[PDB]
Amino acid sequence: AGPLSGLRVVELAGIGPGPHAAMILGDLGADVVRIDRPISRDAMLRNRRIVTADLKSDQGLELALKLIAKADVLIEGYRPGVTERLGLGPEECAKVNDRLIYARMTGWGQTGPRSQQAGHDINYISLNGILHAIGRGDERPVPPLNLVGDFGGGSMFLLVGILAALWERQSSGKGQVVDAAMVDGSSVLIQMMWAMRATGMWTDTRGANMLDGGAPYYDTYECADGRYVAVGAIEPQFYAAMLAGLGLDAAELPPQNDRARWPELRALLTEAFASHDRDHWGAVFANSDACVTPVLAFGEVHNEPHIIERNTFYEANGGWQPMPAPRFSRTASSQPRPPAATIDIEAVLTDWDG
Amino acid sequence: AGPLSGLRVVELAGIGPGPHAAMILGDLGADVVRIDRPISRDAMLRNRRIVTADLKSDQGLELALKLIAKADVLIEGYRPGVTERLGLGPEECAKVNDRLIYARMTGWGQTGPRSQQAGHDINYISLNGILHAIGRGDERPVPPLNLVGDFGGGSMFLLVGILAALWERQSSGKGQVVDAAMVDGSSVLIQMMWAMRATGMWTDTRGANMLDGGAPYYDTYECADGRYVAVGAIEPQFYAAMLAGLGLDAAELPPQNDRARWPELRALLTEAFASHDRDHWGAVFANSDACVTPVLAFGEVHNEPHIIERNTFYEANGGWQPMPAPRFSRTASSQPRPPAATIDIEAVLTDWDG
Ligand SMILES: CCCCCCCCCCCC[C@@H](C)C(=O)SCCNC(=O)CCNC(=O)[C@H](O)C(C)(C)COP(=O)(O)OP(=O)(O)OC[C@H]1O[C@@H](n2cnc3c(N)ncnc32)[C@H](O)[C@@H]1OP(=O)(O)O
């Protein structure tokens, strides 16, 4: 259905960014075959075919190399050296398929003093300034779940890597190795802060910048029911619209960008938002340019009309899953196929004519 | 010198995800031409040629269509309808270039009850459950900068769309429109949590899950010097290594996953970490699998040897900026070319033959 219809992807079963990257390829129509160790309830494994092989046996390695020989992309998220030892390194795969985009998904990268060291998202964004920038200033840093290292600065960059190399392959006729490190990707994800730091527009003080919570017009507020709204009214005209819905006289308030009076401004805004329930503000702004929105819990998302009308989610059995993003006007993506039964690796090899 | 060498991109000057998406294309070797209104210190504007046009004028519109006519990709991030009213909408562009990938970068999407409504990253993640999940449980949610909406679920999905549509064009010989809504992209970015919620592995309770700060083995700790380490020792063997390095006896501790005793477990780890300075812990956990890393501020990143050795950053006039990601073994990217003076739109047309 989607734009990636026809792309053949071999995924070497891992955790975090690799399976997320392979999911998105599958979402957009790619033919994704996942090799695991010898039906899943993990919705992330939608849009797959699962085969199983012992990659350490002679037989297991033979079939995998036959399946790789007929594929465009290979995704692996093991420590550097692992596929090399298995006999599935890029130098080995090239001998059977020099068009393969060999996509290596790691946190620390392929080389360097930390390249062989265990880690998780929180570690990768700890070394590059990111984690230090997240949270309130009166407290130790909070992890932004694993959104920044694993996915935003991880699978997403593997994805751009894969498709960019597929583009390069059109003219070269050949593939290459993509080295996607969470530490690199997340750095480029946050290039805006690096840019701002050079010009005095961002500081290393946590919780005291325009976009981290420090600004009263870009932060959440608790309402009378103990739920929250999000205020994002950066531009003066949107800020104006926000004060107008709150019924605050701007002449009575400190200026929007007088940072010396920010705690005063926040105390006034906090008093206003505390005077009514979330769904009141919910309704007072619902339609304006005030950049004020309800802070919905996951369990409330499916009831939001904008979410509903655009089909951002679909029901799997037992809960909502996000539909494929982004959206394409001519070759639209299908509703994802749920995880299905592990199939015979020989069936795939015949299908792919390997 | 990257993989996207040869790719022609027109960027309509904007803010946030569009410009970040444009930068990454230029990073990977694309020929990006940014049309602005009638020399920048914004590092995000690297790898561009900048031209000027009044798109409200007859001459300016005409010039843009000549430029778009010779491009592969067009990036625009205005409210839906804005390009249509300028005479640069998808249907207008189709008439001069039906190979064009028309990439539309919004928060709320091209259609829907909120599609005409102003907003910013914090709004888009407020409506889909993401923001509610970020922060400590005792206090209101904290924005994870604009990493999640603008970039990870914003420009990154625009990029995936652009590149996937280009693969698609290989067989169809045609472009199409890419509708990248931040509200969609970020939901796919947090799909692991939608997976986990369905299987009893994630709760809507802020700050009480595996990866949100709720686990003592996945969080930051404050050290003797008032600086922090990140701990991410999820796996038992990594956890065991962590305890060893702290000098703690596992038989004297609650089990790693006895959530009932998590506050007990956290208190003991807190005491341990606070007994030495942050850099003591890096020394202690230098090469180990304890998943313990120093929480560095942006200003300190350039001193970290793993950062240094892998050339994750380059020095640009001003300060450090992230080098391109991900990395490619055969067609590697160049160090980004700095922002330069605005050039004559007509010289670009001569170059591109438009
Ligand atoms: C320092 C802070 C102050 C700077 C501004 C704030 C941004 C800085 C903060 C950092 C990033 C912010 C972060 C949190 C974000 O979320 S960024 C993403 C924000 N959202 C989006 O981009 C979603 C799609 N965009 C939009 O909804 C809206 O463009 C915005 C962003 C809400 C802004 O609203 P707006 O200013 O009314 O813009 P639009 O409604 O698109 O109207 C644009 C008008 O300008 C005109 N225009 C543009 N270029 C030209 C040109 N070269 N020549 C002649 N005219 C030009 C267009 O024709 C259009 O006019 P019209 O259609 O109104 O008649």
Side-chain angles (χ1 to χ4, degrees):
Chain A
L4 295 187
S5 192
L7 195 67
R8 291 168 174 187
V9 184
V10 181
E11 173 194 5
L12 299 186
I15 292 198
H20 179 74
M23 179 191 78
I24 294 170
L25 295 173
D27 290 350
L28 310 196
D31 194 342
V32 183
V33 175
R34 168 174 168 106
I35 305 170
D36 215 323
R37 315 177 189 214
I39 136 197
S40 171
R41 272 236 291 152
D42 172 9
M44 182 171 297
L45 306 180
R46 71 205 193 175
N47 289 323
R48 307 300 221 283
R49 279 182 297 179
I50 306 302
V51 301
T52 239
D54 168 27
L55 297 180
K56 286 207 153 141
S57 68
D58 273 345
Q59 168 192 346
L61 174 57
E62 193 177 79
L63 303 154
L65 275 173
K66 282 184 165 194
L67 214 42
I68 287 160
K70 282 275 181 166
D72 296 292
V73 182
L74 172 65
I75 296 176
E76 64 91 20
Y78 308 123
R79 283 189 221 237
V82 172
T83 64
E84 283 89 334
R85 284 175 208 111
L86 282 180
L88 291 171
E91 282 205 344
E92 287 306 299
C93 287
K95 306 192 197 176
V96 308
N97 190 185
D98 64 14
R99 295 178 43 85
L100 192 73
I101 310 303
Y102 194 112
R104 318 202 67 176
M105 184 67 246
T106 69
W108 294 131
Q110 289 294 311
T111 71
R114 296 172 175 283
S115 69
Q116 290 292 322
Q117 173 164 261
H120 285 280
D121 176 292
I122 193 180
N123 302 113
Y124 310 131
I125 66 172
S126 76
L127 213 75
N128 67 186
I130 293 169
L131 174 64
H132 185 278
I134 295 158
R136 314 259 147 66
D138 57 356
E139 277 158 337
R140 71 193 189 283
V142 78
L145 324 174
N146 59 339
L147 282 162
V148 181
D150 281 348
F151 308 123
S155 55
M156 296 312 293
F157 276 88
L158 192 66
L159 278 171
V160 173
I162 287 147
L163 299 154
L166 286 170
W167 156 268
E168 191 280 340
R169 191 173 72 174
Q170 307 172 5
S171 55
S172 67
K174 280 179 142 63
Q176 68 186 296
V177 181
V178 181
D179 167 18
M182 296 184 247
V183 73
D184 294 337
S186 61
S187 298
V188 180
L189 207 68
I190 198 169
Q191 189 274 335
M192 197 180 91
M193 279 70 202
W194 289 107
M196 286 187 306
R197 202 170 102 91
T199 56
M201 283 185 61
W202 194 269
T203 71
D204 298 357
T205 306
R206 175 179 54 265
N209 295 282
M210 183 177 303
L211 302 179
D212 64 6
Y217 55 81
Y218 197 98
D219 203 3
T220 64
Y221 285 84
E222 187 168 334
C223 299
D225 55 342
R227 290 178 164 74
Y228 320 89
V229 284
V231 182
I234 293 170
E235 290 86 355
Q237 69 276 24
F238 305 154
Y239 182 81
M242 190 273 289
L243 295 181
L246 294 179
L248 300 178
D249 188 343
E252 295 274 12
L253 301 207
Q256 183 194 356
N257 278 297
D258 176 1
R259 290 158 78 133
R261 292 181 64 196
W262 271 359
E264 182 176 356
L265 176 60
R266 192 187 303 273
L268 290 160
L269 298 183
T270 302
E271 181 173 49
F273 283 116
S275 67
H276 290 276
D277 284 352
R278 180 195 78 196
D279 311 342
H280 187 252
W281 303 119
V284 164
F285 295 104
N287 314 119
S288 65
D289 284 349
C291 294
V292 172
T293 48
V295 182
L296 307 185
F298 294 129
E300 302 190 271
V301 171
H302 72 289
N303 290 339
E304 190 61 30
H306 192 74
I307 301 290
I308 299 168
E309 315 293 294
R310 290 189 69 250
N311 298 293
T312 300
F313 291 84
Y314 69 103
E315 280 187 300
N317 65 341
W320 299 86
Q321 301 301 329
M323 278 282 281
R327 304 185 182 192
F328 304 85
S329 53
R330 190 171 36 85
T331 64
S333 296
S334 306
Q335 192 171 292
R337 289 167 319 280
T342 319
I343 57 168
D344 181 18
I345 185 164
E346 293 278 17
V348 178
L349 276 170
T350 295
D351 169 42
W352 277 11
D353 280 301
Chain B
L4 303 176
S5 172
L7 186 71
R8 294 179 170 179
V9 183
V10 182
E11 171 193 3
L12 300 187
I15 289 160
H20 178 78
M23 177 192 74
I24 291 164
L25 293 165
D27 287 353
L28 305 202
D31 184 353
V32 184
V33 175
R34 177 175 157 111
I35 302 166
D36 220 310
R37 314 202 201 212
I39 168 172
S40 181
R41 299 170 330 112
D42 175 4
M44 188 167 296
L45 306 182
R46 70 206 198 181
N47 293 317
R48 314 289 218 285
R49 281 184 287 172
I50 316 285
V51 296
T52 254
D54 181 359
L55 305 170
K56 293 272 173 66
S57 74
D58 296 353
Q59 177 192 142
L61 166 63
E62 200 172 79
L63 284 175
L65 281 168
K66 286 181 177 175
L67 204 92
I68 287 155
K70 283 278 177 175
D72 292 299
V73 185
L74 175 62
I75 292 159
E76 70 88 19
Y78 307 123
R79 262 186 258 218
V82 164
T83 58
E84 282 91 336
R85 281 183 277 96
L86 283 167
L88 290 166
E91 298 184 16
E92 283 303 300
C93 290
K95 307 184 168 187
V96 290
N97 193 171
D98 69 324
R99 287 177 60 85
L100 180 75
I101 311 309
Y102 198 109
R104 321 197 69 167
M105 175 80 247
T106 64
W108 294 128
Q110 286 301 312
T111 35
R114 287 183 186 267
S115 52
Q116 292 302 305
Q117 184 171 63
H120 280 285
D121 178 289
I122 190 170
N123 301 118
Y124 311 134
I125 69 167
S126 58
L127 233 242
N128 62 191
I130 295 166
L131 177 61
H132 187 274
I134 296 148
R136 299 298 166 183
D138 23 84
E139 38 169 6
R140 60 192 197 279
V142 77
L145 316 181
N146 59 338
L147 286 157
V148 175
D150 282 355
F151 301 130
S155 57
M156 296 315 295
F157 286 82
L158 190 74
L159 286 167
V160 166
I162 291 173
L163 293 169
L166 287 161
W167 159 268
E168 197 283 313
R169 191 176 70 172
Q170 282 180 77
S171 58
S172 59
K174 262 157 185 51
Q176 55 187 306
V177 181
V178 183
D179 172 24
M182 286 184 258
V183 72
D184 294 328
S186 65
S187 303
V188 179
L189 207 70
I190 203 169
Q191 193 260 352
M192 197 176 91
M193 283 69 209
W194 293 107
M196 289 176 284
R197 246 248 281 168
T199 56
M201 291 185 64
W202 198 274
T203 73
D204 282 6
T205 304
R206 182 160 62 265
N209 297 289
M210 183 162 309
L211 308 169
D212 64 7
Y217 55 83
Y218 199 91
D219 205 352
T220 57
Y221 286 89
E222 187 175 336
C223 304
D225 52 342
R227 295 181 185 106
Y228 315 92
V229 281
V231 183
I234 291 170
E235 291 83 349
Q237 70 283 17
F238 300 160
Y239 182 81
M242 186 265 293
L243 286 194
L246 297 173
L248 302 174
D249 187 325
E252 293 261 336
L253 296 205
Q256 181 193 357
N257 285 121
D258 178 352
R259 290 181 65 153
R261 299 176 58 186
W262 268 3
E264 188 176 351
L265 176 59
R266 187 179 306 270
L268 290 159
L269 304 176
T270 297
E271 189 184 32
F273 277 115
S275 72
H276 288 283
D277 290 345
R278 180 199 66 190
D279 290 357
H280 183 254
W281 300 119
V284 172
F285 297 110
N287 275 91
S288 91
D289 279 356
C291 293
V292 180
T293 48
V295 176
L296 308 186
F298 295 126
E300 305 187 271
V301 172
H302 74 284
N303 292 322
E304 183 68 21
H306 187 76
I307 301 288
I308 297 162
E309 293 177 32
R310 285 196 67 252
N311 292 320
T312 294
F313 292 87
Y314 71 105
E315 271 194 294
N317 303 46
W320 295 87
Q321 303 296 334
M323 276 289 285
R327 324 208 168 167
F328 305 86
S329 54
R330 185 168 43 69
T331 58
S333 300
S334 310
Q335 188 177 289
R337 295 178 304 271
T342 303
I343 48 160
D344 189 25
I345 179 151
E346 300 276 42
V348 183
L349 291 185
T350 291
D351 169 17
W352 279 13
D353 275 306

